[PDB]
Design a protein around this ligand. Sequence first.
Ligand code: HEC
Ligand code: HEC
Ligand code: HEC
Ligand code: HEC
Ligand SMILES: O=S([O-])[O-]
Length: 208
Amino acid sequence: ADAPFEGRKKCSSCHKAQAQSWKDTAHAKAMESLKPNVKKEAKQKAKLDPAKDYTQDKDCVGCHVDGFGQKGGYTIESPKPMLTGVGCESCHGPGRNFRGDHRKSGQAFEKSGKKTPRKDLAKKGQDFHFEERCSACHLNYEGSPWKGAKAPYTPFTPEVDAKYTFKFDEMVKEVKAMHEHYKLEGVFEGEPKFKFHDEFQASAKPAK
Ligand code: HEC
Ligand code: HEC
Ligand code: HEC
Ligand code: HEC
Ligand SMILES: O=S([O-])[O-]
């Protein structure tokens, strides 16, 4: 089983606070990095060509868009703007099947306070762990600590520069590059629950 990708539109329409915050992160602008003459210095350090247009190179786009190589995902032949940049489904998982449960569950909660178990969403493909997905992009290089590495690899590795060292427990809390967290009403409950969920909700900004 597995759900296809659809893009950021629906998620963004119901979750405007996260979407507006996400919009300003490096992830949202990931495709701009593949354009000619952008990030020239970093590209030279990694021995890449600073003037090359890498926006349609299959050795690069896969980690700068949503669901490359997966059903419903971004393709160089049909590069959907709503799948351009590392977006919502790249971390939360393809949403085709679970976004429907977010709608119905939210309606049920608004009408009667009924909560829905996270177990139902995980069954529909939602990710509440994240490590593996971040790793498929950030730790995808030869000999990396992550067991799933396979080409094409990311040019940006600790070997190129120590700043490219990725540690999940640290980076997932990187407030300068992850979307801000906002308070949830509590529609969903139970396991699997992200290990830092309560920590993030206790420190979250008001839903407004
Ligand atoms: C409106 C019809 C929604 C759409 C479209 C999507 N989501 Fe949703 N989501 C919705 C509700 C009413 C809730 C509960 C909010 C609350 O206050 O409790 C959610 C919740 C989430 C969560 C949090 C899950 C948890 O562990 O508690 C996430 C991470 C989330 N939604 C993500 C998400 C994504 C990526 C979507 C696009 C595929 C998406 N949602 C669509 C309502 C709606
Ligand atoms: C591939 C589809 C990715 C997934 C999944 C995740 N990240 Fe990522 N991240 C990716 C790229 C291509 C970039 C660079 C964007 C650009 O063009 O500039 C990034 C960047 C970050 C950063 C900022 C840079 C840094 O400080 O290291 C952070 C903090 C980051 N990414 C974190 C992160 C986490 C915690 C993820 C899983 C929840 C995650 N990323 C997934 C590509 C991809
Ligand atoms: C996933 C396996 C990737 C492939 C294939 C490529 N890139 Fe990407 N890129 C990836 C990550 C995880 C990051 C973030 C690194 C960090 O920690 O900051 C990036 C980042 C870039 C950047 C920005 C670098 C910086 O600002 O210092 C550029 C310019 C970039 N990537 C270009 C690029 C090109 C041209 C690729 C094909 C040759 C390419 N990347 C592939 C992950 C992945
Ligand atoms: C990986 C780099 C992510 C991207 C891209 C997006 N989100 Fe996210 N989101 C991420 C994490 C690790 C978490 C915490 C999980 C938890 O259960 O605590 C979240 C959480 C949310 C939530 C829950 C409420 C909140 O924390 O604000 C929502 C509604 C949510 N995310 C929505 C969302 C949307 C619409 C995105 C695309 C614009 C999006 N997220 C991208 C990691 C990542
Ligand atoms: O519909 S409720 O989750 O705001």
